[PDB]
Every structure is written in C-alpha cells, then in structure tokens.
Amino acid sequence: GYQLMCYYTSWAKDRPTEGSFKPGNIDPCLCTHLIYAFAGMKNNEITYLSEQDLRDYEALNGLKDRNTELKTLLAIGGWKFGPAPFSSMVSTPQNRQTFIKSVIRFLRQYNFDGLNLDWQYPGSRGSPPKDKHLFSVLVQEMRKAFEEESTLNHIPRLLLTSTGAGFIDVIKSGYKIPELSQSLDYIQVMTYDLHDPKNGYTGENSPLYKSPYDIGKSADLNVDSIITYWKDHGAASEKLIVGFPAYGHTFILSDPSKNGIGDPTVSAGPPGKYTNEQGLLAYFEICTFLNEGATEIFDATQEVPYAYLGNEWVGYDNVRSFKLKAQWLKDNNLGGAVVWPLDMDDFSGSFCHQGRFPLTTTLKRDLNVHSASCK
C-alpha cells in the first residue's frame, strides 16, 4: 500500500483559542504514521525540551491503543535547529555512538516506533562538505544499530527516516542518495516552501508542475521535477514520501490588479491570527481568508490554488490539489505522502466546513489507507 505520515508540532497546542490543537485529538485511524516535531539534542544525545513534550508523547502514543497498527516517529532537527548540532554529533565515531545509543534508549522508553532525522542541512548553511559523507555514515551506523537491537530483543526493528531537501543545489551538496536510500526506510522529500518572497514575485508553495515563467533553476521548483531528480539520482520510488503542505505562503502585491502567479511583490504577507508566522497561513486560516471574500483561482498549469484580497496574495493547497497530487504519486509508484503539519489542516472542521482534517482525509481516501484495527 501507501503510507500517509502526519506531523504534529509541539507548538500547535499553544496557538490561541480556536487555533489550539492537542495531539490526543488526532483521529487514530487517519494516518499510518504520526511524526512528533521536535526532539532536541544535549551533549550528543537526543532529548525532550519541556515536560509538556512528555505529556504530548503519552497522548500521541496512546492513539496506538485505538489503531494498533499506527506508528509514531520522533523527529529531530528542522530549519530553526540548523546544522551545527548535527555537524558536531557526526564529527567523531564516539559522538555518533553516544547519539545512536541515546536514540534507541529514548525511543524505546517513550514508546516511539522510529526516528526521523531532519538535518537542515548537511553540506550547507555552514555545515562543511565532509558532512555529506558523515551524514551517510551516521545513517548507516544508525540502521545497523537498529537491526542489532531488534535481533537482541526479538522485537520489530525501529524505523529510520530522513527528510530530503527539495532544492537541487542543497540535494547535491548534502545527500549521498544511493547510500541513503539503501539504509533508510523512507525519505520524506520536502516538496514545499518552493517560492520564497526574496525573488519579488508571487510563487506557489508546492506546485505539481512548473509555471511557464519558471526558467533556469526555477524550472525545478515543483513536485514533479524534485521527485524525478531524487529517482534519477538513485532513490527507491517506494521509499519516497512526498511532502504535502497543509499551509500556504503569503505575499504583498506591488499592484493589486497584477494578481497572478509570477506577478511583482513588495514583501511577505503578515502573520495570521492563529499561526503567527510572517509569510505563512495555515489551510484553516486560508479558509477564513476565502470566507472573507478573497478571489480564489485554481491554476491548472501548476495544479494548485491561489487567492487574493486587496494586496494580499496566498499560494497554497486545497482538496483538489491534494487529489491531483495523490493520483500523480500513485501513477509514479511512490511510497506515500507526509502532511506537513497535520495541525494546520482544519482539525476541528470549524474553519472550512469540509469535515475534520479535510486535506488529510482526502489523502487517506485516495491512497486507500487502512489498517486491520480501525474496522
């Protein structure tokens, strides 16, 4: 079958009033895997960062009592964390063993089924070129240690996944694709955040295909090109998990009458009421934007929507774009999808009136997600 992985972010519960979403309220039958963002690191060991995280782990893993086939993964890293803790940890065999041993202990004591590595990124952002090789060594050693622990304790092996960059230059400087594909269970490809406001033009967050004005390096800023790059450079199709964002990016239009894709912008758009991130809106916040009168366009060239009201423009994903991408990933024999983050889908059903988790429910249906337990 297909996997449907779903992130829960620790900060989702701290959004105000109706934006607050707690992990215990995830539907246990919606996803095949839940990924908790994030663990941190201390003295080359994985760790939690707040006692509240431990309450989240209890709630998240408690969902496995309702869907006994559900798996949980603990993610370490992310953009904000950056590369430096990973560079230090991979730099010596001793530090890698300290880390690997801590991961086995931590995942087993907190009832997680596996680890998601999310180093952003080996070989860039200050991480030296040697980290492309040392990341591959870390992943091989982690996979071997997981195999050994499974044999020792006669229990199913811990899963090992990694994020994979969506920008071709970052992929080249960071990832030994054939070796990583050998040792990882899955590669979660970060097919999102594809147009940043630095360029000064509106662009889609996760278009399936290129726009006619995407020239040169921009021609690869789409899901189809990125996944093709990973496969062309030796990744196993069935191990690739495509990133499906449950949010969009916002822009301020230079001219409110020039409101298409590729039109000039002034800056990123303002933070939303609930998510409070400059240049981003959750899908549930975009439903409000639409309800408040934004003009909604489905761009068939890129197979994604955008919407605008006054000088605010948002490029995002909706039920239709998720449906078209799900058909494309089945047609391309991919491993499945990861919803980043589940907590920005309309978890309550109150913002969009499309039922609970409308984006993710679309993927569950169209990827035929099921397990023995949920029947």
Residue numbers in the entry: 0 to 374
What does the primary publication say about this deposited structure?
Ym1 (encoded by the Chil3 gene) and Ym2 (encoded by the Chil4 gene) are CLPs belonging to the glycoside hydrolase family 18 (GH18) and are unique to mice, with no known human orthologues. Ym1 and Ym2 are among the most strongly induced proteins in the airways of mice after allergen exposure and both proteins readily form pseudo-CLCs in vivo.
In parallel, we produced recombinant Ym1 and Ym2 protein in FreeStyle 293 F cells. Thus, recombinant Ym1 and Ym2 protein crystals can be generated in vitro and are biosimilar to native Ym1 and Ym2 crystals. (C–E) Structural superposition of the X-ray structures determined from a native in vivo grown Ym1 crystal isolated from the BAL fluid of mev/mev mice (C+E) (yellow), a native in vivo grown Ym2 crystal isolated from the BAL fluid of a C57BL/6J-Tg(CAG-Gal10)Bla mouse (D+E) (blue) and a recombinant Ym1 (C) and Ym2 (D) crystal (grey). The low root-mean-square deviations (RMSDs) establish structural similarity.
